[PDB]
Design a protein around this ligand. Structure first.
Ligand code: MG
Ligand code: MG
Ligand code: MG
Ligand code: MG
Ligand code: MG
Ligand code: MG
Ligand code: MG
Ligand code: MG
Ligand code: MG
Ligand code: MG
Ligand code: MG
Ligand code: MG
Ligand code: MG
Ligand code: MG
Ligand code: MG
Ligand code: MG
Ligand code: MG
Ligand code: MG
Ligand code: MG
Ligand code: MG
Ligand code: MG
Ligand code: MG
Ligand code: MG
Ligand code: MG
Ligand code: MG
Ligand code: MG
Ligand code: MG
Ligand code: MG
Ligand code: MG
Ligand code: MG
Ligand code: MG
Ligand code: MG
Ligand code: MG
Ligand code: MG
Ligand code: MG
Ligand code: MG
Ligand code: MG
Ligand code: MG
Ligand code: MG
Ligand code: MG
Ligand code: MG
Ligand code: MG
Ligand code: MG
Ligand code: MG
Ligand code: MG
Ligand code: MG
Ligand code: MG
Ligand code: MG
Ligand code: MG
Ligand code: MG
Ligand code: MG
Ligand code: MG
Lengths: 97, 95
RNA sequence: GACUCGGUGAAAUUAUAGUACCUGUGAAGAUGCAGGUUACCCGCGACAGGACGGAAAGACCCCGUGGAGCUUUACUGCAAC
RNA sequence: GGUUCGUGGUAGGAGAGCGUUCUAAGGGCGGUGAAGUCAGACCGGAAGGACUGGUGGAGCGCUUAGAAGUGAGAAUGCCGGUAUGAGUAGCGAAAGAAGGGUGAGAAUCCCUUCCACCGAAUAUCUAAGGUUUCCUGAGGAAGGCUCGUCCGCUCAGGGUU
RNA sequence: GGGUAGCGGAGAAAUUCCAAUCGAACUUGGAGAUAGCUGGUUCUCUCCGAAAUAGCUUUAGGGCUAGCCUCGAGGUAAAGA
RNA sequence: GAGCUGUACGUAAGCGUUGAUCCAGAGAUUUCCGAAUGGGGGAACCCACUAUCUUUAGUCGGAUAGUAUCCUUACGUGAAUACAUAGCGUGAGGAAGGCAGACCCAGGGAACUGAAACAUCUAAGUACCUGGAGGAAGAGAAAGAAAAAUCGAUUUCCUGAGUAGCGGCGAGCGAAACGGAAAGAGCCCAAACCAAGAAGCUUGCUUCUUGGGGUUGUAGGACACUCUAUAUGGAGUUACAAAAGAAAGUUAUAAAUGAAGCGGUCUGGAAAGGCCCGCCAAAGACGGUAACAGCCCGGUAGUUGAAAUGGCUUUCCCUCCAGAGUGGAUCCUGAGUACGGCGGAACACGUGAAAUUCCGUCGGAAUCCGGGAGGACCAUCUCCCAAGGCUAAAUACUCCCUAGUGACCGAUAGUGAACCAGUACCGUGAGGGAAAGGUGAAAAGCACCCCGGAAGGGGAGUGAAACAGUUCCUGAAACCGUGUGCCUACAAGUAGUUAGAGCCCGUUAAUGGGUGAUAGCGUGCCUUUUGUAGAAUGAACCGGCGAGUUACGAUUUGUUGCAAGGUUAA
């Protein structure tokens, strides 16, 4: 309340809408994949057991942030272009389940 | 109550401990007893009442029951009381 | 009726009070502050100038985005027709 | 531990504490006198705390922590007590007097006589309403605007066909 | 002896009366209504210490942001005086 | 198992081991009023009638029983009106009223208030009124939730989430499903059709009653055949049909038994306390007892106990009972219903793009080749099968009962009420509504003397104490007095303070205490104010009571644990 001066929130317009079908992915940066042993097949189920992602909202997306050392086989619902390149640049294969 | 009128009790507490007497009356609603020659009090009595010369009367006042123990004629000592059944009615027993 | 004596015995009010006057000063009108001027201690009958005396959180006046009653071509309604 | 600069203060911010009730644990006091209460010229920078003695007559400190119905001088605060005004206002329309009696005690109760007042009422019935106030015998704390031996008051008995 | 009852009665009309209440009875409840108003708010010491302004406001004795106070922390061509 | 005839401070007359008083179960009695019910009535009263009996010479009296109204239902009478209906009468059943100021469901339904005004909105479907209840109610076995590809009645909790939304898009309002739990349980009809009547006479077709049958979705049933049951088995009074009994066990409602110190000594009125010795403990709970007790008393642990009544659990009795398969000719599967328009409401959802659910009104389907839903609507797909009913548990609340608990109160508190309190008292009434606890261990409650009419005192006595004396533990302050150390009748006083003689004392022993001639200085406290000694406010005084709290969220600082992790809720 501003003692009758029109409050800030009414001086400015409402914006946008909420999407009923909004997908939010559980994010996994490369750095945490170094945790795993070399030549290992990283699944969502393996990513929740280990305790890296607890709730797999809409799916698991792999993002680049950090740098991967080990040569893995990572299967996730989505990969960033950079993440895919980086997983491969190390000497691994990405699959999109 | 562990004693009743007629019982020979020893007094174990008060100005009269060590003294024994007969139980003249029991007041179980007050949990008190009247022992012969125990707890004598001087009652300042007006003539009016049954006592046509009044006067300072010296009589027994009631003691609390928990202040007397029963006397066993065999030993002649203060004893706690047990209850044992002969067959028809139960009876008090010394220990 | 008042007053004196004998009997009985309230109340409003009340920060504590050993509670003068004048001129001044000061929230601008002082028993209470300053400078003076008066004044032995305690009462009783009287009078009301002051204690901005008592009584009543001013009814006047204004204020409150307080009430309430009333009015109408104020607004929105409702009954009834 | 020194040095330097500081230490007026309302609203208000910050800090450290005192004391109250209760709980826990530890350790105590107490009928050779607990708490409370009264008094004192004692101690601490403050809130406060002891000691000694009286009263009191059975419970209470201390330490560390914990929890709060935790601190009053003001609210025309609420309840209680007690002042002040003050031996003051008042004692509610009115005619009494003396003698005798009763009694611990009498202007005030009883009796007598005179006086005075109402008399289309201040008399006699009676409805309402009240509900025992009626009668008798005791009483005199309170009530009665004084007094009181008296009473519509107190206590007993009675009483309405 | 009865009747009319509160968003109502009754009024030879005064806002008059409806149990010492009437521009809308009384009582209980909603109810601790609401009160930008008035009053009040209880132990101690130590350190610091304002404001009574601007802007906007059915706003003007209220409020909000800023200004001015305080506590903590940070950071350096020290930018303050 | 020895006393008893209630409080409470009595007098009297009595009872009791040939078992009283007392405790528990079960009976009997139970005036009048009150729904109040034979009629009336100003509750606790008045007045009857009809039978039967009783009393008297008969009136006059007495006793017992019946006699309200409505609903349902038999039967009988029976009008206008012929049959008949209404009406009237009799007999059965049933209802009526109350309340736990709670919880539940329904009908009806505010305003203050918030929105810094106010009208939509909020408060709130709350308060309140009315009805219905039940021990719980409501809900409930999908015309559901969904769309991880599946789940499988309802309810309640955690979560989702202050999210999605709603909203003068303001103030505010605010889900649900998924996920995790508690608890779990499923059933009966209507209709096809079959049988038996009954009627209408549509006169062999139709609709009405009773019984069988039958209960559901890529369907189920009827209907055809077929296999086994016709109590072999199974199931029950908590739904799934409904009444009955027994017996045994167990719990409740009285009780019983129950270890160990009269230990010594000290203080004391008294010992349970101190000191010194013992002992019991499945018992060191609590209370009482002359101060604080495991061993004094009632008890406590443990172990026993019920004639009678009630509850529960089992078992028996009793009662009741068909359930698989195969086809798909036909038939059935809830109509003034669903739905729609108009007007409202409920849905978190304010008419909105408004699905879903309900009410009024009007219109009004399909009916298995069928119908509904998936948030306007259409198509596809998916999931369901409405217009009938029942259903325990997990949930809510507490007038009560039993046993317990409390960093809850301790007499201005705690209930309004510790006490004869919803009393006294106030009010026409609805209604409002107090104050008021403590002798002592024990009455031992003050014989007797004295003054006084008494009250009240002073002795004497009791008692540990009477300065504990029947309202009597303690006994503060205001306030009222008596006594007297210092001062005071020439003084002008916010009453003190600083200096200070004199006089009087003698301490928590201190560069002490009381008083104060005289001298200097000095306008209370609080509130509110630019500014108050204020001629502004508040307080007569003393005492007690009397105001930032808690819950749930947000945020920030401190602390601690763990740390790319941390943490669980129910
Ligand atoms: Mg006089
Ligand atoms: Mg001037
Ligand atoms: Mg002047
Ligand atoms: Mg002067
Ligand atoms: Mg003055
Ligand atoms: Mg005045
Ligand atoms: Mg005023
Ligand atoms: Mg005014
Ligand atoms: Mg200074
Ligand atoms: Mg300072
Ligand atoms: Mg602070
Ligand atoms: Mg205490
Ligand atoms: Mg005291
Ligand atoms: Mg307080
Ligand atoms: Mg006071
Ligand atoms: Mg005077
Ligand atoms: Mg006079
Ligand atoms: Mg006079
Ligand atoms: Mg007179
Ligand atoms: Mg005349
Ligand atoms: Mg008389
Ligand atoms: Mg008198
Ligand atoms: Mg008399
Ligand atoms: Mg009037
Ligand atoms: Mg309200
Ligand atoms: Mg109020
Ligand atoms: Mg400063
Ligand atoms: Mg504006
Ligand atoms: Mg101001
Ligand atoms: Mg017997
Ligand atoms: Mg009757
Ligand atoms: Mg407002
Ligand atoms: Mg024993
Ligand atoms: Mg001794
Ligand atoms: Mg004692
Ligand atoms: Mg004791
Ligand atoms: Mg509609
Ligand atoms: Mg709505
Ligand atoms: Mg639809
Ligand atoms: Mg319609
Ligand atoms: Mg529909
Ligand atoms: Mg859709
Ligand atoms: Mg939607
Ligand atoms: Mg169907
Ligand atoms: Mg009370
Ligand atoms: Mg007290
Ligand atoms: Mg009270
Ligand atoms: Mg007294
Ligand atoms: Mg002189
Ligand atoms: Mg002179
Ligand atoms: Mg005043
Ligand atoms: Mg916080």
């Amino acid at each position: 309340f501003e003692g009758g001066q029109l409050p800030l929130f009414r001086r400015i317009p409402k914006r946008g809408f909420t999407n009923i079908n909004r997908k939010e992915f559980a994010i996994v940066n490369l750095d945490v994949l170094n945790r795993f042993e070399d030549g290992t097949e990283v699944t969502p189920e393996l990513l929740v057991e280990t305790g890296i992602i607890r709730n797999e909202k809409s799916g698991i997306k792999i993002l680049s942030n950090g740098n991967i050392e080990k040569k893995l086989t990572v299967k996730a619902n989505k990969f960033s272009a950079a993440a895919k390149e980086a997983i491969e640049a190390a000497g691994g294969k990405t699959e999109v389940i | 109550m562990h004693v009743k009128k007629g019982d020979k009790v020893k007094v174990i507490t008060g100005k009269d401990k060590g003294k024994s007497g007969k139980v003249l009356a029991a007041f179980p609603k007050k949990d008190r007893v009247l022992i012969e020659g125990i707890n004598m009090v001087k009652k300042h009595t007006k003539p009016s009442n049954v006592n046509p010369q009044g006067g300072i009367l010296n009589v027994e006042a009631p003691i609390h029951v928990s202040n007397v123990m029963l006397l066993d004629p065999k030993t002649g000592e203060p004893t706690r009381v047990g209850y044992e059944v002969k067959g028809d009615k139960k009876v008090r027993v010394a220990k």
